[PDB]
Amino acid sequence: RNRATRVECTTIVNGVRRSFYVYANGGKGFCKLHNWNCVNCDTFCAGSTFISDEVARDLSLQFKRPINPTDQSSYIVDSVTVKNGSIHLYFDKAGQKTYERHSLSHFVNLDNLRANNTKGSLPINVIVFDGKSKCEESSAKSASVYYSQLMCQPILLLDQALVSDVG
Amino acid sequence: RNRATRVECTTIVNGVRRSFYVYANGGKGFCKLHNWNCVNCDTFCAGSTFISDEVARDLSLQFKRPINPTDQSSYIVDSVTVKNGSIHLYFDKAGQKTYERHSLSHFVNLDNLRANNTKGSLPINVIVFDGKSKCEESSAKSASVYYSQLMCQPILLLDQALVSDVG
């Protein structure tokens, strides 16, 4: 019936309503795992379908049919260890302890990465917030879905106190 | 029935909704290849009809009748070679390897050409983005349809790393 490639939806960040697109296959396959027309929905490359939990229920409310989400919006870090110029971030995943690695060059300046920057884009997949301030944590949680929908793959949350002492 | 010259539609770039016009013949011919009233739809000159794939499905949804697109929104470059002050850009086209040439004077300053500049207009048909950053690639992909609808002919995408070493 529908050959559309992008699906529009809205989200609220910092008290304003933004918009972003959700990509679709366009007419091939059905992907009965989450009953959506997806293109290679197993890789975090650009252009791949990514249905977050927060927008899955809104999409399944606009389209009157059940829709199953694929990945959670964000996860909370628990431990970080530096090694030979690389940093490992540890977080839980469906009850299993996993880790991810990134370059240390991105952590030289936290201010351009924290929360809602002036540029409006994130250079890396992590975000830094103060754990004591409730408002900062709430704003980071709110912006997590938007930044995980603008680019594929989930967003990892870093506490400022935890990463302050390692750098 | 309709003698209108321009058709309105909308697109989303950088989280805001812009508008642009689509030109029509105005009452002569039917162009059964894509069942739309077009004026000389074989030349990339100004004022010619240009139906991109991304907006073709939206137009065929506003107008309850099938509409066939003419050209894809954008293509990805694969190789560049300089020669006697000229640069050739190689990209695939329907399974055939083709190339396009442009002057080297436009590449002296990449910053006024990359992504969404302050001016809001592109001086040439190419765009430069960082391949490592997912967000930059997504923004370029989103703006590609808008910049290929503001002016005729498709937009060619250049990776910043690829063109960095040749200049």
Add this chain to the structure above:
Amino acid sequence: WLIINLVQMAPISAMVRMYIFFASFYYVWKSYVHVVDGCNSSTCMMCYKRNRATRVECTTIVNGVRRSFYVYANGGKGFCKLHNWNCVNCDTFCAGSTFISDEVARDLSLQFKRPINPTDQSSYIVDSVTVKNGSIHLYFDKAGQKTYE
């Protein structure tokens, strides 16, 4: 009295056999559902997913041309806990062996949606040269230890 009649309807063995029949049918139906439609746990790759194949294709940028290359695997037999990859004789260098570097490790981790561990650095710097018996010896430092070829 209704409960008394219900509980004394049939002997225990008949009840057990009837429960076994329904349980077997339910499990057969669930297995049939699991065969076609796919399971939720796609991370473990179960058996309905690919990426168990011997070869994996990736791309890299050199000068002005994008080049492709293959990455080898065991095809499903065995798994390495240290490298988190289906490596084959990764401790020796030969035709058909596997080699992962940080320049490709991140891309492969992004493609497979799980972290992987690179095995060695891409390149090293030679600091001294010695020539003997018509042969040339190149010395370099690796992890604080002297090595030569």
Add this chain to the structure above:
Amino acid sequence: WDLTAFGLVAEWFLAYILFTRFFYVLGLAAIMQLFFSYFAVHFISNSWLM
């Protein structure tokens, strides 16, 4: 040779191909018939309506 079972299997396969909303009630009837034929006797007493 005899091939009645293969014919019945083909009929069931073609029925499963032509899936509708009312296949479930037929499957329920078939499984109930199998269950009743397999045990019977034990839980049938009095109650001529039953």
